[PDB]
Design a protein around this ligand. Structure first.
Ligand SMILES: O=C(Cc1cc(F)ccc1F)Nc1cncc2ccccc12
Ligand SMILES: O=C(Cc1cc(F)ccc1F)Nc1cncc2ccccc12
Ligand SMILES: [Cl-]
Lengths: 305, 305
């Protein structure tokens, strides 16, 4: 029993965190094989950030300008190249702690673990979701740039996020490990804002299934709904549309609890129109949307890595 | 910006998780130096559980009755001793991944990270607090016994909890790493129940200070309170009494925000009375009590917004 916001064990990623320094700017890098990946804005000064020409700022740098520290060991940079908004620093030493990994680009609604780092040293691990507006509600301070988001499938670490910036509302923006930003964001000091966010409907349904598995059924009802009527109600409450793919993905949880997906949608419909009436679900007075259907199955079955 | 329930990076603890088997029972063990620590109930059958005589069950065992597996490597048990409710298995190999560590016994209200494990393999990491009733609201399934709770302040792992059992309400009971249970619990299948739980007042106050540091002041009011009047009100909402020690501990957060501890107590009183009126504090519609004053100082900026 119990249901917690659970992150993947971060050990395989901790062995990849390094400190990257260029001039006065210090941030984090991910050392995989003989390459260190970090945000390209490490080459910028505060004036450079206002309108950076990254190719022009980069051409002025030599390998010895990038100080890379792996614990208390300085790595020597033997090459440097840019791929989108990520800077790739070729080093002489391959990371002996390099796990089996892949670079994956995730979709909004998908969750991942973030290993927050400062000066190449991991400070904490938390779970979060890629919001439908492509921001993440992270917990980051100055120096956290280069911290990474990941998932683990079997023994393979799938790197999906690299932290680049904080938006005016305190939410975060970053890229995949190929340097492509999630969202309409740019790595530049200019006016940028998170778009109006929506609730990840399939994740709320997965969390309602987790609550039923954990013994909370007060919200269930005798009712069902059509997928189209539920989507009219979801549109009204700033909830993401629920697709047939989402219904299919919820199949295993539906079979385990004996509550049809559209049966759970009618419980959600009632919660949206009426609220919780002073009650909680899994210790929350809000409908939680940062657990995917897979996260619920993984936690309610004890999958290991 | 941002405030998340953040766990410590689990890598230093992952390198200590092993599987301990005694007959048909399999659970987790913590391998530090040449000793493997695990719950002593690994030697019990299930029938044994009602009224086990651990000293009598243990005397019937030899070292080779204990099978310890670290990854795909069997460790050889060369000695065994019981210390309270923990079984200590001396092995013939010191763990080369043994971090700098210490065993600490924590008090209710203290938080720690739990690395949930099954078959000596880590599955997830989450943050939780030792409830005032000495239970933890964990997320554990069968086979999670031997999973540990820890804090990693300045490169040293402080092991504070070892998971032993699940109570009828779905909450969890365990021991420190010296085998002393937290609370009035025993490693027996007899009728045992968690005492009525209360809210960790000092932690709620710390979290309100975190919200002020992150720019949220809607809940503040022009009132103050005496420490005794706050306690008479708070006890009526099942909140733990706030002591002078708690007020002292909140001193740094009070100085950083400019809000006196008893002024924040008056906000808490009003929050208890009024609820949130459709508002949230740090993304929560409930008063969060699983962040200590120390956790808030660790995660939040030193500059208030
Ligand atoms: O946002 C940036 C740097 C930056 C990158 C960029 F692409 C455009 C403009 C910029 F300012 N770094 C930060 C990340 N996360 C949290 C922070 C908290 C406080 C201060 C900076 C934080
Ligand atoms: O509680 C026990 C075993 C046990 C230990 C003991 F000291 C006394 C009585 C006992 F039953 N195991 C479990 C631990 N955590 C979570 C679980 C979830 C489901 C089923 C078992 C779980
Ligand atoms: Cl450019």
């Amino acid at each position: 029993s119990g249901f917690r916001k659970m992150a993947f064990p971060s050990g395989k990623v901790e062995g990849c965190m390094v400190q990257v320094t260029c001039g006065t700017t210090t941030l984090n890098g991910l050392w995989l094989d003989d390459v260190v990946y970090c945000p390209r804005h490490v080459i910028c000064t505060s004036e450079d950030m206002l309108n950076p020409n990254y190719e022009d700022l980069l051409i002025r740098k030599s390998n010895h300008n990038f100080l890379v520290q792996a614990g208390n060991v300085q790595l020597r940079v033997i090459g440097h190249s840019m791929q989108n908004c990520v800077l790739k620093l070729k080093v002489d030493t391959a990371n002996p702690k390099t796990p089996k990994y892949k670079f994956v680009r995730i979709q909004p609604g998908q969750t991942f673990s973030v290993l927050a780092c400062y000066n190449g040293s991991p400070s904490g691990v938390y779970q979060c979701a890629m919001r439908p507006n492509f921001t993440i509600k992270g917990s980051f301070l100055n120096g956290s740039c280069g911290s990474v988001g990941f998932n683990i499938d079997y023994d393979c670490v799938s790197f999906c996020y690299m932290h680049h910036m904080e938006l005016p509302t305190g939410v975060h923006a970053g890229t995949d490990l190929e340097g492509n930003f999630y969202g309409p964001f740019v790595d530049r000091q200019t006016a940028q804002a998170a778009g109006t966010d929506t609730t990840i409907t399939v994740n709320v349904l997965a969390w309602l299934y987790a609550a039923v598995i954990n013994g909370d059924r007060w919200f269930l009802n005798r009712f069902t709904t059509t997928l189209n009527d539920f989507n009219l109600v979801a549109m009204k409450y700033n909830y993401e549309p629920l697709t047939q793919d989402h219904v299919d993905i919820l199949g295993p949880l539906s079979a385990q609890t004996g509550i049809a997906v559209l049966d759970m949608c009618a419980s959600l419909k009632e919660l949206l129109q009426n609220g919780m009436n002073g009650r909680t679900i899994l210790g929350s007075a809000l409908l939680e949307d940062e657990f995917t259907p897979f996260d619920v199955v993984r936690q309610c079955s004890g999958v290991t890595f």
